């Protein structure tokens, strides 16, 4: 005989009305007249916002920085809305609509003569930020499959995560940090300016601890 265990019941999860993803517009209703610089720092380093679950139990987690534009938004929204179950799953956005204006000059143009006209809009995303959240009376495996499908098509590295999965990753990162066996740490060397390494490092490396390189995040870097 094979021993059996009780099924995880769902009697305390209520799906909200309008369970499908809301349409995301390519441009803001009030377009920005003033053009801003490419402050590339909004995709650098770890995310400080939308890092934890709010209502759902599954999500798409970003493992690197990047810009999301309307094509990406349409792709994820269409795939999610055509692959989910309205009666048992609900999906909620966690990234705003594209608001950062990207300008480009006319084709075949020489350098100079002012900035280019605003061409489109993007949503900056940092590593460690949840992009779409999912909830309802469903397990993780089906949503994990058809959410990894979407996450593989993002401009950055991404994964399909759950509450337990994300907690497990964070606890394993802490465990690796404490049971690391060599006595030489990027944090220690960078903060003490050992060997004068700050002439090669960056002022952001004191907080990035060697785990971030540009818009790339290394989860095995400790």
């Amino acid at each position: 005989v094979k021993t059996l265990l009780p099924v995880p019941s769902f009697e305390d999860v209520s799906i909200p009305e309008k369970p499908k993803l809301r349409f995301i517009e390519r441009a803001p209703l009030v377009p920005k007249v003033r053009r801003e610089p490419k402050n590339l720092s909004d995709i650098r380093g770890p995310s400080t916002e939308a890092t934890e679950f709010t209502e759902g139990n599954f999500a798409i987690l970003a493992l690197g920085g990047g810009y999301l534009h309307w094509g990406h938004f349409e792709m994820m929204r269409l795939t999610i809305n055509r692959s989910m179950d309205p009666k048992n799953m609900f999906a909620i956005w966690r990234v705003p609509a594209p608001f950062k204006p990207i300008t480009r000059k006319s084709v075949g143009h020489r350098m100079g003569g002012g900035k280019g006209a605003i061409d489109h809009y993007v949503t900056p995303v940092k590593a460690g930020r949840l992009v779409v959240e999912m909830g309802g009376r469903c397990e993780f495996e089906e949503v994990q499959g058809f959410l990894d499908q979407v996450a593989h098509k993002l401009p950055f590295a991404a994964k399909a995560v759950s509450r337990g999965t994300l907690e497990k990753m964070r606890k394993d990162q802490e465990e690796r940090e404490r049971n690391n066996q060599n006595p030489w740490t990027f944090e220690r060397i960078a903060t003490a300016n050992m060997l004068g390494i700050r002439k090669v490092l960056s002022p952001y490396d004191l907080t990035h601890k060697g785990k971030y390189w540009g818009k790339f995040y290394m989860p095995k870097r400790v």
Binding site: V7, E139, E141, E142, G145, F146
Partner: peptide, 18 residues
Amino acid sequence: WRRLRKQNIWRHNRLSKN
């Protein structure tokens, strides 16, 4: 045990869609 096994069958059917 019959009801528990029915619940197990329901869980398996729900999971086995992809």
